[PDB]
Ligand binder design. Structure first.
Ligand SMILES: *[C@@H]1O[C@H](CO)[C@@H](O)[C@H](O)[C@H]1NC(C)=O
Ligand SMILES: *[C@@H]1O[C@H](CO)[C@@H](O)[C@H](O)[C@H]1NC(C)=O
Lengths: 432, 158, 122, 192, 438, 121, 428, 127
């Protein structure tokens, strides 16, 4: 027998590479090229989604595309002024009392010589007391830029597509465990389009499971690892902010503007959000039905609210419409398992530092008008605690706060392999 | 690189002298910009130099009444003498030295030289004349002396 | 079939479809990810073509060489190889013992070239 | 240091003139100064020479005294020369200075007259060469309140000067005279 | 005869290329590629290659890379533009000894705070070399007549770390291996490497520090030894240890000047005010100077009286020995070392002095404010080189005077890149033989 | 090693052409490394194209049909291939290379045109 | 009868690609040296069509000029604290004498500095209070004066695999299939001049005066008239300006206008009379072949709008003229010198972009440029078909029409060398 | 020169095919700003186009040659002219214009024919 050379053999190895964007704004789709699938019969490929390299590259990409969008906007460095603030009581609701503060300060004008007396509205979570004289909360760590009004935070879908010489393997397993062997693997050019939403406790506008509710963890015995739940039937939610704000442009420099909240047209009420009752009960019943497989039969699985920490991790924080919400969600995780609607007391903050960074915030300008908003709840991020053994009772609390876990629920059926076309094999021929 | 001084020609006594040397067609990097003085009754002397970061070095005989400043924006440097006296009448040059060791360094890129005379007198007429030299025409004419009080005196004999 | 449709098939069926894999190896500051990947693909394709060209093997897909098959690399018979095994398990088996084959072909081609050099001189 | 030099060197044209600069531990450097013009370096080390300088200029050192040698003195080479060294305390020190004069036209004697006032005396000296001249007074010599014109070139191209003396209508003494000395030659003129 | 074409012949050619660096701070090595374990060195047997240490392009490439990395590392720190105002400084006088009197100034000035409309009145201790008088007396900083420059934010350290200069694909690096090399001329034993050894970019002006030693003798390198305008690099055989210290117990307090920017200022000194000592052993330095004099006589003569005098610079970087000691930039006299006349546990102390406003790469309108370091400061390093400069009086003389000098930073890295040359591989080649194509 | 036969005989350095032939392929370090990699690809593709013009593609040692001129080198076989290195050969024929490159191009140009009419039978 | 394969044949199709430079603000040092005596071929049997209006070279040239301008304006000083209140009076009524408070290199001290400003770049705030007109829309950079604005010629070359063509037909109107297509390695010496309604320092025609339009029967598309003879235009700024440097802070300067040395006189650009009359006679003689052979053609003055589009604009020596040019386009055709009162503005919104200026510094001495007019950008004011008169007022404001005066005999194509053919031969 | 005798007959252009292929890669004289990134992208695009042109010649067994013949049938629906009226008095610019759609089937036919020919050559050498 003599060795031969075959060029173009179908073998691959696992590797890491540079995945370029593709699309059908903050997320710069101008650079993305505009936008197929080949089934593979007799192959079984070992998958892993907690060691996946696509999620970290996607997270760094999302951070950098966020950072390049705030570059040409106004710095808002002169806004750090000694504010002078009082309450606002144009017929304020008793639950709303103390949240909104009228404020007035001295601001520089377009000319460098003169100055003007400007009034604005600020929430209680934005101003802090000087130790009535107040000041902004960002004047202590880092003064930060303002989000420009022309760009929008709407999550356009993007496709992550591999270059030449690589391939993306997609599982068609209908009951995929999240790791281990995959009986049916399909080779696609690239993904289905991922919406890069931002959330903390509940996943929004995600991809649904197609047959049953799947719960995936890196280690179900360990309590320090998060628990990702994927739904099969969506739960509808309503965003609501029932106020009519007026944006007035205050000019603080030669060609720079500071869009401040002017006044409220009418009554002020809380910016609640509504979820259905029976739909949530049926979905949570399916969830508590499945979790008894991993944890044991006749075990009392109950749900408590969030443990603590800062406001971002503890509260549900989404971005619908253009304002930043921070909702309570304590009427959602209360039950113990052996036409009503659950309303949630939500609150709005303006100075936002999103990607867990210090010294880099961003002022969100107010949006004129009333905001109506709906979305689907197609995923939860749970976290158990250190309960004692043989108690037959476990409490699950909504965790979150890490932005990798939102995009690990979409890139859970993908991997990147490096095709190598060279191989050797023996046969009967001999070179003449 | 060409240098040229500019400033007043007649300075009243016990005042502050000021001059400015402008650098044309060159840079301020790595060059000691000096100031030099040529008196007829005291020979050639040295005032001091300034490096482009502001490190100065003044003459020890004139230390305490000299100040040299650099300005890289307008591409020039300036000299200030305080409490001038009638013994400071000379011709002032601006020169340069290369960066390194001054054990063998020699002054180059000299200026044209502006005459500066420090006086203490007032306007008077000739008693047959400090601000204007008198013209005597009828013969032979002699150049005028400089007295210690600060006046002039010439003669003209056929 | 498609780009990798013969990956699950056996060797005797996947050796007839070597054209489809070989054809698809060469298909605002953050648009540099598009530029960085293309040079990498070009360099990898040029490395594969150069390594084919060292063995006197370029220009063809199925290519035969007169280096004998050492039994220490694979002691199994040829009868079960080409109809009861896919290419992935072959890559798994000869993930080891590959670098010395890549040098044996390298020396054997130069020996054959010098023997051709001697025969064409007389 | 002091860096002493001879005050004056006068040679005939076509001959060599040497000038010495004593008391120099560090390498010397010679500057050529002409009236109305910026100084030019002529010998920038002990022996070297920059570009553009003619071949007639050279220098050497023996011990602590360094000399400059001019091969041929023309009318161009009538100037003043200063030697310069480096010292650690005062960074640059210069010499006293030597004037080099060429003898283009031959020697003649000065002409001097004395006039009485109507009290200041006037003593004008005309038509002498070279410009090295000294003026003396007596009353018993006079060593106070005397001012002397520095020698200058007139339209004749032949040097002339003047002297003045301030007195009180001391016009006690019986004899006044103005003494001019011209490199050895003495002319005396005298009076109330 | 008949022509053939050969591919891959061992033929190189001299060329210039953009070398990339690898390593195992100011010099950001998080962007550099990790290097290999066990770097292969291939010895070339029957070869002679012409070398030149004064004309190789990798010295200027290294200088440009160090300038670029030092400029890049000062980008996200504090700008410190609103600082310089009309200072009002009086003399500090605390427990001051005989020396360092009138050197530290106690300055008081206004500053802005986090809020725009409020002000504050803070005080700091400033050295004499940073302040200049305008006309207690009114002073001001020396920098903001040309530029106001960035502070170095203190999470970035100034310790040198080794970088290995690799070679790109298609090129090669030839490494000299002769033990007696003056840097110019042919070399009998040439080796090739994938990358250079560990080169640490140390900054010094009179005495080369922390460098690579010699192996047999004290070599002396110059471009033209008969010329007196060329620097004479000396490479030591046995290293000479130097200990520099600052005995003042310094205190750093943080003054906040804006919404997110802090200015670290010198506070009150706890203890006594003393000058910065710098110690070199006398007997080791005497032996090393004797070795240098013995090696210097082979270029000039067997009876010349070699002397050493102190430096004669104009500014402070050429006159005084300058380096860093973990954050504080020193400027040291070194006139007790270079003072001897060589005919044919005592330690020398040096009055080292400290400056803060640093203009180091000699670019017009760029500087750097080095923050004070809390506590005492100590370094132990060894001298592995000198940068001398001959004072050329005249020809055929019997006395030569050598003075230290520097300022040009390319001579500090030409003493480590002398045994290296970059070449370009040309694999094509033709030759005649007897064979025929069919 | 890599090029350890650079000082050896041309008759013995031709056994080892592959280990020099296989190493032509192998933010400050961003665009600089990009132009370095691109220019390496330029040099390798230029070399392979120049072998492609002369008709010696895929071959390390290629016999051709261009006459050797005695004016190029009067020095004969038994010392060029016995006691001379490749560097001295590159220094000797350094300013004669364009003529032999053009002659190889001309010979390959005339070689292929005499083959197309032969296969028309 | 079996397929053969041919490689290397000359076959091209039209495509778009990124070209590169070949040779101040326009970066000369970033271009490759030009290629010497680029030889020219002739396609003797070609009917390949050209297009002047829908080629991608003009868009790429516009983007490259804008990007080069923004790059060259980057490392210069920003005049953001110069925007203060201005107390101004009259000079000796166009020039203003403005005095202002202004910061120094010490942060707590201030100085009173006066300067001279034109009337076109100050506005009155509510009669001795003024401000610049950029202080409510921009905060804009002074062009640091070591750079120049000289239109050095720039050659465009095609990348490898792409070739740029060259039409050699003399009587070629810009659109349609021309009988003669050639090929060149690189374009000729195109100079990026800045102009409005008078193309100057450009390339002449061959024998006669071309008239180029999309459609001649529409009053919305510009008519790029190109001359066959040059019409020389030449002028001065008669004032004598002094430049003083005002230090704004730690190491940055601002060059202000000093005192006038001589006597103030307005700028004026004058052109020959008989030469302009015969050039307009050629234009009205040959232009009648498109609109009717018995028509009345009259030229009105400018239509209106901003000062950039109404007035002839050019950067003669660094100062930006805005000359009236109403004394030229004033005639009625039926089958000495002309002076032009001209005015100078300093702050400039160049490429019709709102938010970025540039502050042109004053220059010392008198300036003088002699230039040749080689083209016009006339537009048509349409009307009903009832009268035999047509009013052709000048127009402009679009910088692509300056670069569609050039790049007319050029088109880039993509070579596809692979090609198959039927033959009776066999591979064995 | 480049594209010389492009308007001539196919027989005259077949003798000058070797000068076009020298510079589909680059010239050597042309081997951080606006122009630098543009020139780098142009160089990368030229390299990719040259390698894409060479790979198709490599697959069909035509590598290393400028003129070659292949053993796949040609259907007469693609073209009806004989050899004499195409190989004289015809330009390639007129020749590419009607095979804009028939080409992609022909390329696959060449690919499968060369794969079958190489497998048949491999089968013969085993004896
Ligand atoms: C030019 O205008 C006429 C008048 O409406 C129109 O019929 C013609 O289509 C236009 N030309 C083009 C190319 O559209
Ligand atoms: C017009 O004048 C310019 C400058 O004087 C000159 O370069 C150009 O050639 C002239 N045009 C002609 C003569 O057609």
């Amino acid at each position: 027998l003599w060795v031969t050379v075959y060029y173009g053999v179908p073998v691959w190895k696992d590797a890491e590479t540079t995945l370029f964007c593709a699309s059908d704004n903050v997320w710069a789709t101008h650079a993305c090229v505009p936008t197929q699938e080949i089934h593979l019969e007799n192959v079984t490929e070992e998958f892993n989604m907690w060691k996946n390299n696509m999620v970290e590259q996607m997270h760094t990409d999302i951070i950098s595309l966020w950072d390049q969008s705030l570059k040409p906007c106004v710095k808002l460095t002169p806004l750090c002024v000694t504010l002078q603030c009082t309450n606002v009581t144009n017929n304020i609701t008793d639950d709303m009392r103390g949240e909104l503060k009228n404020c007035s300060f001295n601001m520089t004008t377009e000319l460098r010589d003169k100055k003007q007396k400007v009034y604005s509205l600020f929430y209680r979570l934005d101003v802090v007391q000087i130790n009535k004289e107040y000041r902004l909360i960002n004047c202590n760590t880092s003064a930060c830029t303002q989000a420009c009004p022309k760009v929008s935070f709407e999550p356009i879908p993007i496709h992550y597509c591999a270059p030449a010489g690589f391939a993306i393997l997609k599982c068609k397993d209908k009951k995929f465990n999240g790791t281990g062997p995959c009986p049916s693997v399909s080779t696609v050019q690239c993904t289905h389009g991922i919406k890069p939403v931002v959330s903390t406790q509940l996943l929004l506008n995600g991809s649904l499971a197609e047959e049953e509710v799947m719960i995936r963890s890196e280690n179900i015995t360990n309590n320090a690892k998060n628990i990702l739940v994927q739904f099969n039937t969506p739960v509808q939610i309503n965003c609501t902010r029932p106020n009519n704000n007026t944006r007035k442009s205050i000019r603080i420099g030669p060609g720079q503007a500071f869009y401040a909240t002017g006044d409220i047209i009418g009554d002020i009420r809380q910016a609640h959000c509504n979820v259905s009752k029976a739909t949530w009960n049926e979905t949570l019943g399916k969830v508590v039905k499945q979790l008894r497989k991993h944890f044991g039969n006749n075990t009392i699985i109950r749900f408590a609210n969030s443990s603590g920490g800062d406001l971002e991790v503890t509260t549900h924080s989404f971005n619908c419409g253009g304002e930043f919400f921070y909702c309570n969600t304590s009427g959602l995780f209360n039950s113990t398992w052996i036409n009503d609607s659950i309303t949630l007391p939500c609150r709005i903050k303006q100075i936002i530092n999103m990607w867990q960074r210090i010294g880099q915030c961003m002022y969100a300008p107010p949006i004129q008008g009333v905001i109506r908003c709906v979305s689907n709840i197609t995923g939860l991020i749970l976290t158990r605690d250190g309960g004692s053994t043989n108690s037959t009772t476990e409490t699950f609390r909504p965790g979150g706060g890490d932005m990798r876990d939102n995009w690990r629920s979409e890139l859970y059926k993908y991997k990147v392999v490096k095709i190598e076309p060279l191989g050797v094999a023996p046969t009967r021929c001999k070179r003449r | 690189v060409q240098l040229q001084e500019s400033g007043p020609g007649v300075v009243k006594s016990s005042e502050t002298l000021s001059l400015t040397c402008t650098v044309s067609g060159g840079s301020m990097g790595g060059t000691y910009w000096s100031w030099l003085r040529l008196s007829p009754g005291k020979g050639l002397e040295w005032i001091g130099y300034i490096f482009h970061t502001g490190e100065t070095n003044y003459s020890p005989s004139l230390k305490g009444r000299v100040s040299i400043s650099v300005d890289t924006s307008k591409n020039q440097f300036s000299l200030r003498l305080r409490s001038v006296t009638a013994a400071d009448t000379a011709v002032y040059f601006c020169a340069s030295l290369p960066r390194g060791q001054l054990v063998n360094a020699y002054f180059r890129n000299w200026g044209r030289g502006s005459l500066v005379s420090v006086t203490a007198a007032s306007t008077k007429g000739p008693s047959v004349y400090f601000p204007e030299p008198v013209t005597v025409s009828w013969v032979h004419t002699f150049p005028a002396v400089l007295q210690s009080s600060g006046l002039y005196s010439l003669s003209s004999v056929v | 079939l498609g780009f990798l449709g013969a990956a699950g098939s056996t060797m005797g069926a996947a050796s007839m479809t070597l054209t489809v894999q070989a054809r698809n190896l060469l298909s605002t500051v953050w648009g540099i990810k598009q530029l960085q990947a293309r040079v990498l693909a070009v360099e990898r394709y040029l490395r594969d073509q150069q390594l084919l060209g060292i063995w006197g093997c370029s220009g063809k897909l199925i290519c035969c060489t007169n280096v004998p098959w050492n039994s220490s690399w694979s002691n199994r018979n040829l009868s079960e190889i080409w109809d009861n095994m896919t290419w992935l398990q072959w890559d798994k088996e000869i993930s080891n013992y590959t670098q010395i084959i890549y040098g044996l072909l390298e020396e054997s081609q130069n020996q054959q070239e010098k023997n051709e050099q001697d025969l064409l001189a007389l | 240091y002091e860096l002493t030099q001879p005050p004056s060197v006068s040679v005939s044209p076509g001959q060599t003139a040497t000038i010495t600069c004593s008391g120099a531990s560090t390498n010397v450097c010679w500057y050529q100064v002409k009236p109305g013009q910026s100084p030019e370096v002529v010998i920038f080390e002990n022996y070297k020479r920059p570009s553009g300088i003619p071949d007639r200029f050279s220098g050497s050192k023996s011990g602590s005294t360094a000399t400059l040698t001019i091969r041929g003195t023309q009318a161009i080479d009538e100037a003043d020369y200063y030697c310069q060294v480096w010292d650690s305390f005062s960074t640059f020190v210069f010499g006293s200075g030597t004037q080099v004069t060429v003898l283009g036209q031959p020697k003649a004697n000065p002409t001097v007259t004395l006039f009485p006032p109507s009290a200041t005396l006037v003593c004008l000296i005309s038509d002498f060469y070279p410009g090295a001249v000294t003026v003396a007074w007596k009353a018993s010599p006079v060593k106070a309140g005397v001012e002397t014109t520095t020698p200058s070139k007139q339209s004749n191209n032949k040097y002339a000067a003047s002297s003045y003396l301030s007195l009180t209508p001391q016009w006690s003494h019986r004899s006044y005279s103005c003494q001019v000395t011209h490199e050895g030659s003495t002319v005396e003129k005298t009076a109330p």
